[PDB]
Short mmCIF file of C-alpha atoms in Angstrom, two decimals:
data_model
loop_
_atom_site.label_atom_id
_atom_site.label_comp_id
_atom_site.label_asym_id
_atom_site.label_seq_id
_atom_site.Cartn_x
_atom_site.Cartn_y
_atom_site.Cartn_z
CA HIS A 8 323.61 -70.04 -25.37
CA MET A 9 326.38 -72.21 -25.21
CA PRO A 10 328.28 -71.35 -22.08
CA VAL A 11 332.63 -71.38 -22.31
CA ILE A 12 334.80 -71.39 -19.39
CA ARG A 13 337.78 -69.53 -19.44
CA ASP A 14 340.27 -67.57 -16.97
CA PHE A 15 339.11 -63.97 -15.57
CA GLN A 16 340.28 -60.99 -16.71
CA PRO A 17 340.26 -57.51 -14.93
CA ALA A 18 337.35 -56.14 -17.33
CA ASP A 19 335.04 -59.06 -15.57
CA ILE A 20 335.13 -57.22 -12.50
CA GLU A 21 332.21 -55.10 -13.30
CA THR A 22 329.78 -58.05 -13.86
CA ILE A 23 331.28 -60.15 -10.97
CA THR A 24 330.63 -57.30 -8.56
CA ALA A 25 327.23 -57.22 -9.94
CA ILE A 26 326.34 -61.18 -9.79
CA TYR A 27 327.89 -61.32 -5.98
CA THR A 28 325.75 -58.02 -5.07
CA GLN A 29 322.55 -59.86 -6.08
CA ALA A 30 323.67 -62.97 -3.76
CA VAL A 31 324.80 -60.99 -0.92
CA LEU A 32 321.35 -59.01 -1.08
CA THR A 33 319.04 -61.73 -2.14
CA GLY A 34 320.70 -64.98 -1.13
CA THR A 35 322.31 -66.84 2.26
CA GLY A 36 325.10 -68.44 0.52
CA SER A 37 326.99 -65.55 1.25
CA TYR A 38 327.43 -64.19 4.97
CA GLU A 39 328.30 -60.72 4.03
CA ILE A 40 325.23 -58.07 4.35
CA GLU A 41 326.52 -55.20 2.22
CA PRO A 42 327.70 -55.76 -1.16
CA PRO A 43 331.41 -55.03 -1.52
CA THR A 44 332.26 -52.46 -4.10
CA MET A 45 333.89 -53.03 -7.66
CA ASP A 46 336.92 -51.47 -5.85
CA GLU A 47 337.24 -54.24 -3.19
CA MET A 48 335.94 -57.18 -5.83
CA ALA A 49 338.92 -56.23 -7.29
CA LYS A 50 341.57 -56.31 -4.72
CA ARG A 51 340.02 -59.32 -3.30
CA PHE A 52 340.63 -61.30 -6.71
CA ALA A 53 343.96 -59.73 -7.37
CA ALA A 54 344.92 -61.04 -3.90
CA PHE A 55 343.73 -64.80 -4.90
CA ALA A 56 345.71 -64.70 -8.11
CA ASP A 57 348.97 -63.41 -6.19
CA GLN A 58 348.63 -66.34 -4.36
CA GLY A 59 348.56 -68.55 -7.38
CA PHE A 60 345.09 -69.66 -7.12
CA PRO A 61 342.64 -70.39 -10.39
CA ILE A 62 339.83 -67.63 -11.07
CA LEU A 63 337.51 -68.86 -13.68
CA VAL A 64 334.30 -67.26 -15.28
CA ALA A 65 331.77 -68.77 -17.50
CA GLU A 66 330.91 -66.62 -20.63
CA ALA A 67 327.90 -67.08 -23.09
CA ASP A 68 326.48 -64.52 -25.55
CA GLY A 69 329.25 -62.27 -24.48
CA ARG A 70 327.92 -62.26 -21.15
CA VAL A 71 329.96 -63.06 -18.02
CA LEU A 72 327.08 -65.90 -16.41
CA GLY A 73 329.04 -66.78 -13.25
CA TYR A 74 332.56 -67.39 -11.30
CA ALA A 75 334.54 -69.77 -9.24
CA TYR A 76 337.96 -69.55 -7.44
CA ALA A 77 339.44 -71.61 -5.02
CA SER A 78 341.39 -70.04 -1.76
CA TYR A 79 343.03 -71.43 1.33
CA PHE A 80 340.58 -72.53 3.97
CA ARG A 81 342.99 -71.74 6.58
CA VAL A 82 346.75 -70.47 6.01
CA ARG A 83 348.68 -72.25 8.46
CA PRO A 84 351.37 -74.35 6.79
CA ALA A 85 350.03 -77.59 7.67
CA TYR A 86 346.89 -76.92 5.84
CA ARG A 87 348.61 -76.29 2.53
CA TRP A 88 347.42 -79.29 0.70
CA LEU A 89 343.57 -78.05 1.10
CA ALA A 90 341.48 -75.91 -1.03
CA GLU A 91 338.27 -74.10 -0.74
CA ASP A 92 335.79 -73.94 -3.65
CA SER A 93 333.54 -70.48 -3.94
CA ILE A 94 331.14 -70.51 -6.98
CA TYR A 95 328.57 -67.77 -7.68
CA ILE A 96 325.81 -68.01 -10.58
CA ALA A 97 324.06 -64.98 -12.26
CA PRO A 98 320.17 -64.98 -11.24
CA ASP A 99 318.74 -65.38 -14.52
CA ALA A 100 321.48 -67.82 -14.92
CA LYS A 101 320.85 -70.41 -12.53
CA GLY A 102 319.17 -73.95 -13.27
CA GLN A 103 321.57 -74.17 -16.86
CA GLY A 104 324.74 -76.08 -15.49
CA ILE A 105 326.82 -73.37 -15.25
CA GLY A 106 327.91 -74.16 -11.65
CA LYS A 107 328.62 -77.67 -13.24
CA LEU A 108 330.56 -76.34 -15.64
CA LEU A 109 333.02 -73.98 -13.22
CA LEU A 110 333.12 -76.61 -10.75
CA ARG A 111 334.64 -79.24 -13.08
CA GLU A 112 337.16 -76.79 -14.63
CA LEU A 113 338.15 -75.67 -11.05
CA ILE A 114 338.88 -79.33 -9.96
CA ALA A 115 341.03 -79.71 -12.63
CA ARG A 116 342.76 -76.45 -11.95
CA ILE A 117 343.37 -77.12 -8.46
CA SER A 118 344.51 -80.98 -9.13
CA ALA A 119 346.70 -79.87 -11.19
CA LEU A 120 347.92 -77.75 -8.55
CA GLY A 121 348.53 -80.41 -6.23
CA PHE A 122 346.32 -80.18 -3.35
CA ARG A 123 345.25 -83.17 -1.50
CA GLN A 124 341.73 -81.95 -0.78
CA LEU A 125 338.95 -79.59 -1.96
CA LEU A 126 336.39 -77.94 0.85
CA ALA A 127 333.15 -76.53 0.01
CA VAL A 128 332.09 -73.94 2.90
CA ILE A 129 328.29 -73.78 1.97
CA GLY A 130 326.29 -70.94 4.00
CA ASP A 131 322.60 -71.46 4.87
CA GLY A 132 322.76 -75.23 4.02
CA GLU A 133 319.64 -76.13 4.61
CA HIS A 134 318.17 -73.59 2.29
CA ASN A 135 321.07 -73.70 -0.15
CA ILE A 136 320.12 -77.24 -2.03
CA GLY A 137 321.49 -75.75 -5.25
CA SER A 138 324.92 -75.73 -3.74
CA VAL A 139 324.43 -78.93 -1.96
CA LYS A 140 323.14 -80.77 -5.03
CA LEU A 141 326.25 -79.13 -7.25
CA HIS A 142 328.84 -80.52 -5.02
CA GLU A 143 327.09 -83.74 -4.63
CA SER A 144 326.95 -83.88 -8.40
CA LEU A 145 330.55 -83.54 -8.65
CA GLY A 146 331.62 -86.06 -5.87
CA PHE A 147 332.11 -84.04 -2.72
CA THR A 148 331.05 -86.01 0.42
CA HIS A 149 329.52 -84.19 3.48
CA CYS A 150 331.80 -83.42 5.89
CA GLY A 151 330.13 -81.17 8.49
CA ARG A 152 327.67 -79.13 9.46
CA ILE A 153 327.72 -76.28 12.05
CA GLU A 154 324.33 -75.27 13.34
CA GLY A 155 323.15 -71.47 13.75
CA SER A 156 326.99 -70.26 12.67
CA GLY A 157 325.22 -67.50 10.74
CA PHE A 158 322.12 -64.80 11.22
CA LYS A 159 321.28 -62.88 8.18
CA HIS A 160 317.80 -61.72 6.82
CA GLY A 161 315.91 -62.49 10.05
CA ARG A 162 317.08 -66.15 10.14
CA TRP A 163 319.40 -68.32 11.26
CA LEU A 164 321.37 -70.30 9.14
CA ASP A 165 323.78 -73.41 8.97
CA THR A 166 327.20 -73.57 7.33
CA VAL A 167 327.12 -77.21 5.49
CA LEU A 168 330.76 -78.48 5.34
CA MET A 169 331.79 -80.90 2.01
CA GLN A 170 334.98 -82.09 0.43
CA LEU A 171 336.47 -83.73 -2.43
CA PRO A 172 339.88 -86.11 -2.15
CA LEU A 173 342.54 -84.90 -4.87
CA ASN A 174 345.65 -86.32 -6.21
CA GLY A 175 345.54 -89.39 -3.65
CA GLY A 176 343.68 -87.56 -0.68
CA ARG A 177 345.29 -88.71 2.61
CA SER A 178 346.13 -92.48 0.94
CA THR A 179 349.69 -91.19 -0.08
CA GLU A 180 352.29 -89.00 1.40
CA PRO A 181 352.60 -85.68 0.41
CA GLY A 182 355.02 -83.70 -2.27
CA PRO A 183 356.00 -80.39 -1.76
CA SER A 184 353.25 -77.94 -0.92
CA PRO A 185 351.22 -76.45 -3.37
CA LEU A 186 351.90 -72.90 -4.45
CA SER A 187 355.65 -72.87 -2.97
CA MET B 9 344.78 -76.00 42.97
CA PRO B 10 345.21 -73.15 39.64
CA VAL B 11 343.52 -69.89 39.56
CA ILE B 12 342.01 -68.76 36.35
CA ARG B 13 342.61 -65.40 35.46
CA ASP B 14 342.56 -62.52 32.74
CA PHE B 15 346.11 -62.88 30.84
CA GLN B 16 348.14 -59.63 31.23
CA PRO B 17 350.88 -58.72 28.51
CA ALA B 18 353.45 -59.62 31.10
CA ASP B 19 352.62 -62.97 30.40
CA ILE B 20 353.78 -63.09 27.22
CA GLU B 21 357.09 -64.94 27.72
CA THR B 22 355.72 -68.25 29.21
CA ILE B 23 352.56 -67.95 26.72
CA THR B 24 355.31 -68.07 23.83
CA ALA B 25 357.18 -70.58 25.78
CA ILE B 26 354.28 -73.21 25.95
CA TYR B 27 353.16 -72.29 22.45
CA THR B 28 356.81 -73.37 21.28
CA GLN B 29 356.36 -76.52 22.65
CA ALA B 30 352.98 -76.93 21.16
CA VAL B 31 353.94 -76.36 17.81
CA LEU B 32 357.31 -78.05 17.94
CA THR B 33 355.81 -81.64 19.49
CA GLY B 34 351.99 -81.40 19.11
CA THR B 35 349.34 -81.14 16.06
CA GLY B 36 346.97 -79.40 17.85
CA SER B 37 348.93 -76.70 16.20
CA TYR B 38 349.18 -76.57 12.47
CA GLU B 39 352.08 -74.37 12.56
CA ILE B 40 355.16 -75.94 11.80
CA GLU B 41 357.53 -73.10 13.49
CA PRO B 42 357.13 -71.44 16.42
CA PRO B 43 356.28 -67.74 16.87
CA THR B 44 358.52 -65.25 18.05
CA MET B 45 357.36 -63.69 21.42
CA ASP B 46 357.01 -60.21 19.41
CA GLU B 47 354.73 -62.25 17.22
CA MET B 48 352.84 -63.62 20.00
CA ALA B 49 352.18 -60.19 21.35
CA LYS B 50 350.78 -59.01 18.13
CA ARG B 51 348.55 -61.74 17.92
CA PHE B 52 347.31 -61.31 21.63
CA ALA B 53 346.87 -57.79 21.13
CA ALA B 54 344.86 -57.98 17.96
CA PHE B 55 342.21 -60.28 20.00
CA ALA B 56 342.42 -57.91 22.92
CA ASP B 57 341.48 -55.42 20.68
CA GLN B 58 338.72 -57.09 19.27
CA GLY B 59 337.09 -57.55 22.84
CA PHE B 60 337.53 -61.28 23.21
CA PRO B 61 338.68 -62.67 26.30
CA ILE B 62 341.90 -64.08 27.06
CA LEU B 63 342.42 -66.48 30.25
CA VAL B 64 345.54 -67.57 31.69
CA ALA B 65 345.77 -70.59 34.65
CA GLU B 66 348.37 -69.84 37.28
CA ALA B 67 349.97 -71.93 40.33
CA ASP B 68 352.99 -70.97 42.45
CA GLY B 69 353.90 -67.89 40.38
CA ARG B 70 353.57 -69.82 37.02
CA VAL B 71 351.21 -69.69 33.91
CA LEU B 72 350.35 -73.02 33.30
CA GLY B 73 347.82 -72.93 30.28
CA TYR B 74 345.66 -70.36 28.37
CA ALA B 75 342.84 -70.28 26.36
CA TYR B 76 341.16 -67.70 24.22
CA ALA B 77 338.28 -66.88 22.01
CA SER B 78 338.31 -65.30 18.43
CA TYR B 79 336.07 -65.38 14.98
CA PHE B 80 335.76 -68.53 13.35
CA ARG B 81 335.30 -66.01 10.33
CA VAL B 82 334.83 -62.67 9.96
CA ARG B 83 332.10 -61.64 7.79
CA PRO B 84 328.90 -60.00 9.33
CA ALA B 85 326.80 -62.85 9.66
CA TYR B 86 329.15 -64.98 11.45
CA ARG B 87 329.13 -62.39 14.59
CA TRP B 88 327.21 -64.73 16.98
CA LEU B 89 330.02 -67.33 16.51
CA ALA B 90 333.13 -67.76 18.57
CA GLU B 91 336.06 -70.13 17.95
CA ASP B 92 338.01 -71.58 21.21
CA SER B 93 341.90 -72.37 21.53
CA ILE B 94 343.51 -74.02 24.45
CA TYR B 95 347.35 -74.56 25.33
CA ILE B 96 348.63 -76.29 28.06
CA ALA B 97 352.37 -76.35 29.30
CA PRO B 98 353.82 -79.55 28.79
CA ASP B 99 354.40 -80.49 32.59
CA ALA B 100 350.60 -79.61 33.33
CA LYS B 101 349.11 -82.25 31.64
CA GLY B 102 346.60 -84.68 33.56
CA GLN B 103 346.03 -82.07 35.91
CA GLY B 104 342.46 -80.60 34.50
CA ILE B 105 343.74 -77.49 33.61
CA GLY B 106 342.11 -77.67 30.06
CA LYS B 107 338.79 -77.69 31.92
CA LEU B 108 339.40 -75.23 34.50
CA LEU B 109 340.24 -72.71 31.45
CA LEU B 110 337.68 -73.92 28.91
CA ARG B 111 334.31 -73.77 31.59
CA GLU B 112 335.68 -70.25 32.38
CA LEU B 113 335.95 -69.51 28.87
CA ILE B 114 332.29 -70.45 28.24
CA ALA B 115 331.26 -68.56 31.08
CA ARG B 116 332.96 -65.30 29.52
CA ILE B 117 332.23 -65.63 25.89
CA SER B 118 328.49 -66.49 26.89
CA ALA B 119 328.49 -63.05 28.93
CA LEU B 120 329.48 -61.30 25.81
CA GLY B 121 326.35 -62.58 23.81
CA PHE B 122 327.76 -65.45 21.48
CA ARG B 123 325.37 -67.92 20.59
CA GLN B 124 327.99 -70.56 19.81
CA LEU B 125 331.41 -71.47 20.97
CA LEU B 126 333.04 -73.61 18.11
CA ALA B 127 336.05 -76.20 18.44
CA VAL B 128 338.27 -77.02 15.33
CA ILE B 129 340.31 -80.04 16.78
CA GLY B 130 343.26 -80.28 14.73
CA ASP B 131 344.72 -83.99 14.45
CA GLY B 132 341.75 -85.11 16.07
CA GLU B 133 342.31 -88.73 15.58
CA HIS B 134 345.44 -88.36 17.85
CA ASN B 135 344.34 -85.79 20.18
CA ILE B 136 341.72 -87.30 21.73
CA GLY B 137 341.89 -85.75 25.32
CA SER B 138 341.37 -82.62 23.49
CA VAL B 139 338.10 -84.01 22.00
CA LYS B 140 336.85 -85.53 25.23
CA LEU B 141 337.70 -82.24 27.20
CA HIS B 142 335.05 -80.61 24.82
CA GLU B 143 332.60 -83.36 25.07
CA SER B 144 332.70 -83.15 28.92
CA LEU B 145 331.93 -79.51 28.98
CA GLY B 146 328.79 -79.98 26.61
CA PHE B 147 329.96 -79.88 23.42
CA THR B 148 328.66 -81.98 20.53
CA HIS B 149 330.19 -83.13 17.33
CA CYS B 150 329.34 -81.28 14.05
CA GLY B 151 332.03 -82.26 11.39
CA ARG B 152 335.19 -83.67 10.57
CA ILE B 153 337.23 -82.46 7.63
CA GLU B 154 339.63 -85.73 6.70
CA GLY B 155 343.18 -85.02 5.59
CA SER B 156 343.01 -81.39 6.16
CA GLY B 157 346.75 -81.15 7.66
CA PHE B 158 350.13 -82.81 7.21
CA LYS B 159 352.55 -82.30 9.65
CA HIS B 160 354.94 -84.51 11.76
CA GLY B 161 355.31 -87.12 8.95
CA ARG B 162 351.36 -88.01 8.92
CA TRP B 163 347.78 -86.74 7.43
CA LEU B 164 345.77 -85.17 10.16
CA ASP B 165 342.10 -84.97 10.51
CA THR B 166 339.92 -81.62 11.83
CA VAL B 167 337.51 -82.57 14.26
CA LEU B 168 334.50 -79.83 14.58
CA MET B 169 332.56 -79.39 17.92
CA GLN B 170 329.93 -76.61 18.73
CA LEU B 171 328.41 -75.34 22.19
CA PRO B 172 325.14 -73.33 21.81
CA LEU B 173 325.26 -70.18 24.46
CA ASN B 174 322.69 -68.26 25.73
CA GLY B 175 319.52 -70.00 23.68
CA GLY B 176 322.05 -71.01 20.43
CA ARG B 177 319.44 -70.82 17.07
CA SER B 178 316.06 -70.80 19.98
CA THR B 179 315.96 -67.08 19.47
CA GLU B 180 316.32 -63.90 17.32
CA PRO B 181 319.38 -62.36 18.47
CA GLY B 182 320.16 -58.79 19.48
CA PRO B 183 322.85 -56.90 18.20
CA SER B 184 326.00 -58.61 17.39
CA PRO B 185 328.45 -59.21 20.10
CA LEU B 186 331.43 -56.68 20.50
CA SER B 187 329.74 -54.00 18.87
#
């Protein structure tokens, strides 16, 4: 039951779609209501890869137990040193430290690309304590809370924002923008 | 005294000139190169097709500023959240035009059924006028992403502020706005 972190491959899309489907249907970290198809998930991940962002999976006993990727928060050029992280875990794999393994490696890959800040945009932050605690444990600091940003499953939801500086943060001038 | 009215396509040349100066001289916009007039027309046509209000301030036959709303993010649970954008002509600063625009934008967004209006203020440490403008109309501070941008030789922080509308999160909503 030992998990290994590796790069995503297209063969993983089926399980990734199943994991995200459960998150959409039963959880409030995702602000989607209707689970995307595998076709749509493959398109989304191909776009992230085309942009140069890392996409990671955790595998144990031949099963993908979770995934993580980075993308832009917003795309305008001054934002090009800011990345955003996304992490989802299979329901039967929660509480096993998989999120920490994924996020630690994602931080390493994003840092190697030259980003200066990694942002978590945590849906339903009041109830999503698992995601908040995961980011706190890896050094993210709280940087905002948009109250009532979502309505889903009959409840108003808040977005909790957290950030982690990388490569010196805003303490030194940047070099060329990452992924250019 | 300026009047606030709906944007018309005929306004796109002045809107483009105003935004061009904001891009080249300011840090509210995180763009580096000014868009073309055709690109601005495309962006505004997209907001209009979505149903969002687009407002201009006019005096003496010239547009002095503009404001619009759009989605913060597009996934369906966010459909009661709108984001405001405001740009003022360089020669029209210190006249209260931003407050005229934002007051009217708040009314138009409220009439559409939104529950929160969000300001994403670029370079909030320097752009204190935008922070104070939002504070003056009831927005409250709800975050600050440090070092979110680098432009014009320095790191910039994003200041986030929000204003509840139509009861905010205190009542269950009806169908999402613009549906």
